[PDB]
Structures are given as structure tokens and as C-alpha cells.
Write an enzyme that holds these catalytic residues in place. Structure first.
Site, PDB file in Angstrom:
ATOM      1  N   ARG A  39       1.070 -30.177  23.698  1.00 25.01           N
ATOM      2  CA  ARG A  39       1.218 -28.999  24.564  1.00 25.01           C
ATOM      3  C   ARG A  39       0.739 -29.273  25.970  1.00 25.01           C
ATOM      4  O   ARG A  39       1.346 -28.799  26.935  1.00 25.01           O
ATOM      5  CB  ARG A  39       0.536 -27.775  23.966  1.00 25.01           C
ATOM      6  CG  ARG A  39       1.270 -27.250  22.736  1.00 25.01           C
ATOM      7  CD  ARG A  39       0.995 -25.778  22.474  1.00 25.01           C
ATOM      8  NE  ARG A  39      -0.431 -25.443  22.586  1.00 25.01           N
ATOM      9  CZ  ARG A  39      -1.304 -25.483  21.585  1.00 25.01           C
ATOM     10  NH1 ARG A  39      -0.912 -25.849  20.367  1.00 25.01           N
ATOM     11  NH2 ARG A  39      -2.574 -25.152  21.809  1.00 25.01           N
TER      12      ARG A  39
ATOM     13  N   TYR B 296       2.526 -28.620  29.450  1.00 25.38           N
ATOM     14  CA  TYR B 296       1.906 -27.891  30.552  1.00 25.38           C
ATOM     15  C   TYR B 296       1.926 -28.685  31.850  1.00 25.38           C
ATOM     16  O   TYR B 296       2.109 -28.099  32.921  1.00 25.38           O
ATOM     17  CB  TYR B 296       0.482 -27.414  30.213  1.00 25.38           C
ATOM     18  CG  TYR B 296       0.354 -26.659  28.905  1.00 25.38           C
ATOM     19  CD1 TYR B 296       1.396 -25.855  28.424  1.00 25.38           C
ATOM     20  CD2 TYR B 296      -0.825 -26.753  28.137  1.00 25.38           C
ATOM     21  CE1 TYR B 296       1.287 -25.177  27.221  1.00 25.38           C
ATOM     22  CE2 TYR B 296      -0.954 -26.069  26.929  1.00 25.38           C
ATOM     23  CZ  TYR B 296       0.102 -25.287  26.480  1.00 25.38           C
ATOM     24  OH  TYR B 296      -0.002 -24.621  25.289  1.00 25.38           O
TER      25      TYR B 296
ATOM     26  N   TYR C  54       4.330 -14.822  30.455  1.00 25.02           N
ATOM     27  CA  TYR C  54       4.211 -13.516  29.770  1.00 25.02           C
ATOM     28  C   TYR C  54       2.742 -13.056  29.705  1.00 25.02           C
ATOM     29  O   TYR C  54       1.823 -13.868  29.748  1.00 25.02           O
ATOM     30  CB  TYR C  54       4.898 -13.525  28.389  1.00 25.02           C
ATOM     31  CG  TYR C  54       4.101 -14.185  27.292  1.00 25.02           C
ATOM     32  CD1 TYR C  54       4.119 -15.582  27.112  1.00 25.02           C
ATOM     33  CD2 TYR C  54       3.320 -13.407  26.426  1.00 25.02           C
ATOM     34  CE1 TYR C  54       3.363 -16.177  26.104  1.00 25.02           C
ATOM     35  CE2 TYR C  54       2.551 -13.990  25.425  1.00 25.02           C
ATOM     36  CZ  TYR C  54       2.582 -15.363  25.259  1.00 25.02           C
ATOM     37  OH  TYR C  54       1.836 -15.899  24.247  1.00 25.02           O
TER      38      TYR C  54
ATOM     39  N   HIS D 103      -0.618 -11.599  31.226  1.00 22.54           N
ATOM     40  CA  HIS D 103      -1.282 -11.896  32.489  1.00 22.54           C
ATOM     41  C   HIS D 103      -1.132 -13.412  32.656  1.00 22.54           C
ATOM     42  O   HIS D 103      -1.453 -14.155  31.744  1.00 22.54           O
ATOM     43  CB  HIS D 103      -2.754 -11.509  32.369  1.00 22.54           C
ATOM     44  CG  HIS D 103      -3.564 -11.716  33.612  1.00 22.54           C
ATOM     45  ND1 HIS D 103      -3.689 -12.946  34.230  1.00 22.54           N
ATOM     46  CD2 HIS D 103      -4.382 -10.868  34.293  1.00 22.54           C
ATOM     47  CE1 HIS D 103      -4.520 -12.841  35.258  1.00 22.54           C
ATOM     48  NE2 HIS D 103      -4.962 -11.592  35.309  1.00 22.54           N
TER      49      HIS D 103
ATOM     50  N   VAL E  58      -4.439 -15.678  31.998  1.00 24.91           N
ATOM     51  CA  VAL E  58      -5.258 -15.408  30.810  1.00 24.91           C
ATOM     52  C   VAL E  58      -4.722 -16.311  29.699  1.00 24.91           C
ATOM     53  O   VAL E  58      -3.615 -16.090  29.167  1.00 24.91           O
ATOM     54  CB  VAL E  58      -5.219 -13.898  30.426  1.00 24.91           C
ATOM     55  CG1 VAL E  58      -5.735 -13.640  29.013  1.00 24.91           C
ATOM     56  CG2 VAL E  58      -6.056 -13.094  31.409  1.00 24.91           C
TER      57      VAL E  58
ATOM     58  N   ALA F 272      -2.669  -9.486  26.468  1.00 23.81           N
ATOM     59  CA  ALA F 272      -2.673  -9.070  25.071  1.00 23.81           C
ATOM     60  C   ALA F 272      -4.018  -8.424  24.718  1.00 23.81           C
ATOM     61  O   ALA F 272      -4.073  -7.534  23.881  1.00 23.81           O
ATOM     62  CB  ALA F 272      -2.378 -10.254  24.174  1.00 23.81           C
TER      63      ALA F 272
ATOM     64  N   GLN G 282      -5.500 -17.206  19.834  1.00 28.12           N
ATOM     65  CA  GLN G 282      -4.931 -18.462  19.278  1.00 28.12           C
ATOM     66  C   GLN G 282      -5.475 -18.813  17.902  1.00 28.12           C
ATOM     67  O   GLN G 282      -5.599 -19.989  17.537  1.00 28.12           O
ATOM     68  CB  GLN G 282      -5.003 -19.648  20.269  1.00 28.12           C
ATOM     69  CG  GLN G 282      -4.457 -19.296  21.660  1.00 28.12           C
ATOM     70  CD  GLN G 282      -3.868 -20.475  22.410  1.00 28.12           C
ATOM     71  OE1 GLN G 282      -4.512 -21.514  22.600  1.00 28.12           O
ATOM     72  NE2 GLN G 282      -2.640 -20.317  22.843  1.00 28.12           N
TER      73      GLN G 282
ATOM     74  N   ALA H 289       0.216  -6.929  19.221  1.00 32.48           N
ATOM     75  CA  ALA H 289       0.894  -5.970  20.088  1.00 32.48           C
ATOM     76  C   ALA H 289       2.401  -6.066  19.864  1.00 32.48           C
ATOM     77  O   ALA H 289       2.939  -7.172  19.693  1.00 32.48           O
ATOM     78  CB  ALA H 289       0.566  -6.239  21.557  1.00 32.48           C
TER      79      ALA H 289
ATOM     80  N   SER I 200      -0.881 -13.833  17.186  1.00 34.42           N
ATOM     81  CA  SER I 200      -1.965 -13.132  16.461  1.00 34.42           C
ATOM     82  C   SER I 200      -3.288 -13.245  17.177  1.00 34.42           C
ATOM     83  O   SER I 200      -3.669 -14.315  17.629  1.00 34.42           O
ATOM     84  CB  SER I 200      -2.128 -13.692  15.042  1.00 34.42           C
ATOM     85  OG  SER I 200      -1.010 -13.353  14.226  1.00 34.42           O
ATOM     86  N   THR I 201      -3.980 -12.123  17.297  1.00 35.89           N
ATOM     87  CA  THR I 201      -5.314 -12.091  17.901  1.00 35.89           C
ATOM     88  C   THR I 201      -6.238 -11.439  16.882  1.00 35.89           C
ATOM     89  O   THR I 201      -5.807 -10.543  16.142  1.00 35.89           O
ATOM     90  CB  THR I 201      -5.280 -11.314  19.230  1.00 35.89           C
ATOM     91  OG1 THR I 201      -4.465 -12.042  20.152  1.00 35.89           O
ATOM     92  CG2 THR I 201      -6.668 -11.139  19.832  1.00 35.89           C
TER      93      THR I 201
HETATM   94  N1  SAH Z   1       1.927  -9.616  21.069  1.00 40.63           N
HETATM   95  C1  SAH Z   1       0.683 -10.116  20.988  1.00 40.63           C
HETATM   96  N2  SAH Z   1      -0.273  -9.467  20.304  1.00 40.63           N
HETATM   97  C2  SAH Z   1      -1.538  -9.934  20.188  1.00 40.63           C
HETATM   98  N3  SAH Z   1      -1.960 -11.080  20.745  1.00 40.63           N
HETATM   99  C3  SAH Z   1      -1.089 -11.829  21.465  1.00 40.63           C
HETATM  100  C4  SAH Z   1       0.296 -11.380  21.632  1.00 40.63           C
HETATM  101  N4  SAH Z   1       0.906 -12.297  22.388  1.00 40.63           N
HETATM  102  C5  SAH Z   1       0.012 -13.261  22.687  1.00 40.63           C
HETATM  103  N5  SAH Z   1      -1.183 -12.977  22.135  1.00 40.63           N
HETATM  104  C6  SAH Z   1      -2.397 -13.819  22.228  1.00 40.63           C
HETATM  105  O1  SAH Z   1      -2.193 -14.808  23.237  1.00 40.63           O
HETATM  106  C7  SAH Z   1      -2.254 -16.126  22.706  1.00 40.63           C
HETATM  107  C8  SAH Z   1      -1.355 -17.082  23.485  1.00 40.63           C
HETATM  108  S1  SAH Z   1      -2.132 -17.406  25.038  1.00 40.63           S
HETATM  109  C9  SAH Z   1      -1.056 -16.395  26.068  1.00 40.63           C
HETATM  110  C10 SAH Z   1      -1.751 -15.087  26.484  1.00 40.63           C
HETATM  111  C11 SAH Z   1      -1.006 -14.226  27.524  1.00 40.63           C
HETATM  112  N6  SAH Z   1      -1.060 -14.862  28.841  1.00 40.63           N
HETATM  113  C12 SAH Z   1      -1.712 -12.908  27.695  1.00 40.63           C
HETATM  114  O2  SAH Z   1      -1.797 -12.391  28.819  1.00 40.63           O
HETATM  115  O3  SAH Z   1      -2.255 -12.327  26.734  1.00 40.63           O
HETATM  116  C13 SAH Z   1      -1.848 -15.932  21.266  1.00 40.63           C
HETATM  117  O4  SAH Z   1      -2.331 -17.025  20.499  1.00 40.63           O
HETATM  118  C14 SAH Z   1      -2.544 -14.619  20.937  1.00 40.63           C
HETATM  119  O5  SAH Z   1      -3.948 -14.836  20.679  1.00 40.63           O
END
Ligand code: SAH
Ligand code: SAH
Ligand code: ZN
Ligand code: ZN
Lengths: 386, 386
Positions: free
Chosen positions: B63, B67, B89, B91, B94, B121, B163, B204, B235-236
């Protein structure tokens, strides 16, 4: 009746989400607490029936009483059978008492209650300071609560403190806060980080043309009256890590993060470094692996399993509509078949996908619409610790 | 050349900020990493020159290499003198490596580099779980980094882990992750919180009609293959406080938060309680103070010092324009006098205020325009711990 609570973000107008705007427009009644006059003005052009919640603060009046009132004003209307929209600046649930208060009461009484997220001052801090909360972890406290409950620091992760402008103040004054207990917060930070460690005084720009205050100080400088005077009702502190925590290379092995029996350098972080932080061993931007990845770009072609977007105007239109038209969404949710039948120009696969409503189906439909022959072939405190 | 990095939020289209959209429209070139097909489709209608960054992931490809490439693609164009917009996607800063990577390189090389915040998220988690990060403090970690660096828990504050779907995975696969080291994360959480403490599995909604996954489990249930299978790339985990920390009533006194020599109840929190948390002593919604505040609303009139919005259409129009038109903002910033002179229908006070540019002046002008005779008289991982 119902309650939707939305945000406006921090910087005026531009940081409002599209859905926040569409819910404000569709509301029977709007209650708002926003601190930028242009955002207020914007909101008033979008709904004919708004009430400014800011008039419910007063000199010597407990903020808790203000929050009780803000919440009750919204709940009265919900109980009358209205579809109410509460609007709070930033994210409406980040350091906001009455939003959560009103929603939890509405929910208890069996009304539909939903909060939509917005851009917080912390989100703005991430962006303006270009720091990532993931490197090396992020801890956020309310400043008085940090003191009151003696909450632990984490010197190896980011520290963010809200409401540094009103330490131990339960009150309000239209002239601003008299932050006389500020010194107590400095004492705690000096105890934890030493007078020499960095603190960034952060104020996100509220107007589109304004610059953020991103002033780098040492904690000890916060004792100077000329420095301390500038921390007010919209001030946040960022405290960078004092040191980095070692990688545990035995945990690395257990997770098999890297090839078997391999080891990374315990002390070294990924590019980029954090501007606001004292020196840390950091990988260079263009070492061997990076150059390899870049030279490899020349040979790059999209992987076999990569599936590009392949949708239609009609599908894009309906999905856009569902995102930006609350009424059309409510109609779709009430009845997937009837709604999908009504949509212009949908392919039968698009139709059925919309009918099903499943995320898999919709994603598949939007990647399987053939497009070529080949393919077809300033005082805004809204929380209190008390 | 220049680089602006913007977000789209989490839920499709609707969670994009107005300014993100206007910067996407104005870009010479757009590079995007978004995981909802409708948002992608939306973005493509807004700029004629876009590149999907998602094609730069691959099976077995680090990855980190992806990046490096995402960042270099944007930087190539910046170096060519283009005004590039990177879109990620949520922020865009973040838990995102390449945004920060590209910006820090651009800045080093003397180009204009700005990140605009979006809805994360975590922001979505606050809203969907109606929790306030301030009560009782919020700690956010990347899941593998939490393990790797043995980062301390705080059992009295909220814990958020990103993550959780790719523990110890440096890699990518189009079929999804094989989260085989997930068990190690559970071990750590059991060690810290016990098999019986609550964990919320949070996803979400990505589509406007979808419901969030807000599944309440015990940490021990994460060991069951049927439960653990559902935790993926989006998943969070939310871990509520195990207990609350006492108010230190002697610190309360020092801050003079309350009347002299008074004491609150050390163990009791403010209404509302956190739904996801084990029982905590919590104040009732309508005790004496709340009823007092509510009955007092009947007598309420706006305080003397409260100053309602009192602006004009012309002023509201120009402020709106500055927020939603990047070109007009760049023009205003280049020259306050010339821009302000050109604005239709401005009052001479409005003009001069715009000319000055000061927040005080503009706020004053927007509260002093008389209106009456009386008044005039799914795999989207964009960060890695490695
Ligand atoms: N729909 C969703 N619901 C809950 N957590 C999410 C999500 N999409 C991304 N995430 C979280 O984001 C991680 C990828 S890192 C990307 C985050 C994104 N920039 C943000 O602003 O949130 C995932 O492993 C998960 O922990
Ligand atoms: N422009 C700004 N810059 C930095 N921090 C700000 C800010 N506006 C508000 N804050 C923070 O927010 C606190 C009030 S609590 C309101 C927070 C708002 N809901 C949000 O989403 O961020 C202030 O004391 C300060 O710590
Ligand atoms: Zn070393
Ligand atoms: Zn007690």
C-alpha cells in the site's frame, strides 16, 4: 414531529455539507447557533422560518440554563408535530450539549431523531496544521474537564484541547470571557510537558479570505499576559508529541506485517514529519522503495480486477437526487419498487438494482453499463463540564 | 503550479462540502480516491479532467507503493505548472498517507499547498452513535499502530479504532482483506477491557438510503467467526468507557467553577447518558434547574447587548460569492480595494468594511445595516503503519 440536527462547519458557508443545506431548506422550523454573520445570513435565505438561539445566552447566566432552553425550544416544536432542524456551527455533536440533549429527549418520547455530521474545528485543525490523527494517535479533551477529572496525558500522541478560552467558567458574558483561571491550565501542561515543549495556538479562519492563527509557542510563553490575552472563545490548543514510542519489533513479527524474520528500525517514522513537532528520525521522501514505485509507474496499466466506473446519466441523476432531495429519499425509502419504477431512462438492470436497494446491486449496476461496442459485445461556547 | 486536497465525506455526494465541490470544479486536473460509485460519478460531471487513483492498488502490492504513486501523479502535474486537486473520501487528511505526502513535498518545493477539511468516518460515528467526544474525552488510534507501539488505553474516555479490518496487513487484495491477525487485536482489547465490555462495530452508511451498522457486541464475541467475518475495510470500532473518573472537587474549587465552598456530586454525569455505555449515575433531564430555566423562557426577551443580524442582500451576496467562487476569492485576496469597489449595491460602510477585510469590521457592517425606520432614526485503505 421530528428532529434533525445539522452542522455548518467552521469557515463561513463553504464548509456546510450539501445534505445540511438540503435539510435546512426542507425544515418546517429552523433553530440555529452559528457564530459567523455570513453563515447566519445564508441560512436565513434558505428557510423562511428561523430562530437565532444565540439570544438565549446572557451575562451571568449559566450556560447550562442556555442549553436547557435551546433544547426545549426545539422540543416544543417537535411535540407540536413539526419537522424541526437544529443547526450548530462546526459538527453539531462535537462539544455541543443541547443538540445531544434535545435528540436524546426526542428519542425517549418516540420521535424520529437524527444527527448529521459536519466539519469540526478539530477537522479544520488537521487540515490547517497538516497532521494526521493516525500518526501517532490523537487524544481530545475539553480543557476544564481535563483539569477537573485529572485526565491522563499521552506524550507520544497528539493532544487537542477545546475551550482553553473559558477555563472553569460556567457562565457567559457578551464582552467575552475573563479567562482568569487560564494559569491553572498552564500549570498542568508545564507539569506534564515542561515549560519548553511546543503548544500551537489554533484558530481556524471563519471568513474565506482570513488566515488561520497557527502560532507556535512554548508552554512557558502562555504565562506572558501579552500571549495569553489572545486565547479566546474560538481558541484550541494543539500539543505535539514530546517523544515517539518505539515499534515493538516482536509484535511486528507476530502480526507478520513484514517478510518472516524481518525487522524495521524501531526509532524511524514514515515521511512526512510533523512540522509542529521536535525532531524525530524520519525516512527521506525518495529512498529506494519510493524511486522503485515511481519508475514502475511508467510500466503501469490498470490491474485485471480493477473495474472502472461504467454507469449512465440516468443512474447518476437518480443517485444525486437521493443524496440532495430529502423528499425524494423519503419517498424511495417508503417504497423501493414504486420509486424505482418512476425514475426516467433507467436500464432494466439499473431499475432492478434500485428496486433491490442493496449496496452490492447498485455498485454492480454502476460498473456494468457498457459504453463502447467492445464492452457491449466571538463567543460560541455550546458545551460545559459542570 | 499548486495542490489543493479536498474530501468528499462518507455518505455519497451529500457529505461533500460546498467548498470541496467548487475547488473540484475549478481544478485544471483532478486525482481522486473515492469508494462510493455515485460520488465518483458526481465528481466526473464536475471536472472534465479526472484520474481515478484506485487503479494504483494491486494484489500483493504494498500500500506504501500505491501511496507513493498516488502522491507522485499529483506532484508531476504540480511541477508542470498545473493547479491540481486531490480528492480523498471522508476528510482527506484523516488516516490518509498520500495527501500529507504530496502536500509536504509540494510545500518543500515552494508550491502553494492547501488541505481543506471534510467529514470523517469518526465525525459520522459521533453523529450516528450520538456521542460527544468531550464527554468523556476521545482517543483515536490506527488498530495496527495501537498493537505495534503498545499504545496506552484510557478506560475512562471514548476509544475509536480505525482499520480493524486489516490488522498487520501491509498489502492489498481486490477480493478484500484476509484479516487473519484480527485475533491479536481482540487479545489486546480483552487484556485491557475484559471479554465482557462493550464494543460497537460501526459502519457509516455510504448510500443515502442505507442504515449504519451500529452493532453492540462484547469484546469476547469478536472471537466468534460469524461475528468477526463482518468486520471489513470500512469497519471502525467504538469502545465506550469502562468506568467514569471522579470529579476532583478540590480542583473544582480552585477553578471557582461553582459558588465559593460548593461541591458537586463526584460520581454523577450530565444528561444525556451514552446509550452504548454501561450504567453511570446521570442527572435526570428535567430536575429543578431545568424546570426553572424552562419556566423562565416565558419571561424571556433578547438581552440588551444581543445584536441580531442586520445586513443586506448585496453584502450577503458578496460573502456567499467569496465562499463559493474560488476565482472571486483569489481576486479579492489579491486586491481588497479594487474588488470591493466592483461589488454591486454595497453601502459605503459595507464597501469600506470589505476594503479593510478585518473580521471586526465585516461583522460590525453585518449587524449595523438598518432595516426599519426605528433603527435608521469495499476496500478503501489509504494509510499504513509500516
Ligand atoms: N463507512 C465507514 N464507516 C465506518 N468507518 C469507516 C468508513 N469508511 C472508512 N472508515 C474508517 O476509515 C478507515 C480507512 S482510512 C480512511 C478514512 C477517511 N479519510 C475518513 O475521513 O474517515 C477504515 O479502515 C475505517 O476504520
Ligand atoms: N475557528 C475555530 N478555530 C479553532 N477552534 C475552534 C474554532 N471555533 C470553535 N473552536 C473550538 O470549539 C470550542 C467551542 S465548542 C464548539 C465546537 C464546534 N461544534 C465544532 O465542531 O468544532 C472552542 O472553545 C474551541 O476550542
Ligand atoms: Zn534507530
Ligand atoms: Zn455520588
Amino acid at each position: 414531529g421530528s428532529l434533525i440536527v445539522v452542522g455548518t462547519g467552521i469557515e463561513s458557508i463553504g464548509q456546510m455539507t450539501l445534505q445540511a443545506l438540503s435539510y435546512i431548506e426542507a425544515a418546517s422550523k429552523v433553530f440555529y447557533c452559528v457564530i459567523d454573520p455570513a453563515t447566519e445570513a445564508f441560512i436565513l435565505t434558505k428557510n423562511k422560518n428561523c430562530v437565532d438561539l444565540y439570544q438565549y445566552y446572557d451575562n451571568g447566566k449559566s450556560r447550562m440554563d442556555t442549553y436547557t432552553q435551546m433544547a426545549e425550544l426545539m422540543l416544543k416544536e417537535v411535540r407540536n408535530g413539526l419537522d424541526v432542524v437544529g443547526v450548530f456551527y462546526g459538527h453539531p455533536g462535537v462539544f455541543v450539549n443541547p443538540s445531544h440533549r434535545a435528540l436524546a429527549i426526542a428519542r425517549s418520547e418516540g420521535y424520529q431523531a437524527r444527527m448529521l455530521p459536519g466539519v469540526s474545528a478539530e477537522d479544520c485543525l488537521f487540515a490547517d496544521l497538516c497532521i494526521d490523527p493516525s500518526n501517532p494517535g490523537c487524544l481530545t479533551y475539553e480543557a476544564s474537564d481535563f483539569l477537573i477529572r485529572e485526565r491522563p496525558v499521552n506524550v507520544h500522541s497528539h493532544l487537542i484541547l477545546f475551550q482553553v478560552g473559558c477555563v472553569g467558567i460556567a457562565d457567559f458574558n457578551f464582552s467575552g470571557f475573563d479567562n482568569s483561571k487560564f494559569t491553572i491550565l498552564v500549570d498542568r501542561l508545564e507539569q506534564e510537558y515542561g515549560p519548553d515543549h511546543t503548544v500551537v495556538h489554533y484558530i481556524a479562519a471563519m471568513m474565506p479570505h482570513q488566515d488561520p492563527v497557527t502560532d507556535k509557542f512554548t508552554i512557558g510563553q502562555l504565562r506572558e499576559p501579552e500571549i495569553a490575552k489572545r486565547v479566546g472563545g474560538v481558541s484550541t490548543f494543539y500539543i505535539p508529541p514530546k517523544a515517539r514510542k518505539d515499534i515493538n519489533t516482536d509484535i511486528i513479527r507476530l502480526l507478520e506485517f513484514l517478510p518472516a524474520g524481518k525487522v524495521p528500525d524501531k526509532h524511524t517514522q514514515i515521511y512526512p514529519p510533523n512540522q509542529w513537532e521536535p525532531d524525530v528520525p524520519t525516512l527521506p521522501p525518495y529512498g529506494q522503495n519510493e524511486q522503485a514505485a515511481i519508475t514502475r509507474l511508467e510500466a503501469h496499466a490498470p490491474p485485471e480486477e480493477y473495474q472502472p466506473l461504467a454507469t449512465s446519466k440516468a443512474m447518476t441523476d437518480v443517485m444525486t437526487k437521493l443524496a440532495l432531495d430529502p423528499k425524494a429519499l423519503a419517498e424511495y425509502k417508503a417504497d423501493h419498487r414504486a420509486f424505482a419504477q418512476s425514475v426516467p431512462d433507467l436500464t432494466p438492470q439499473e431499475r432492478a438494482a434500485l428496486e433491490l436497494g442493496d449496496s452490492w446491486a447498485i455498485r454492480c449496476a454502476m460498473k456494468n453499463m457498457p459504453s463502447s461496442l467492445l464492452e457491449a459485445a466571538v463567543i460560541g461556547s455550546v458545551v460545559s463540564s459542570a
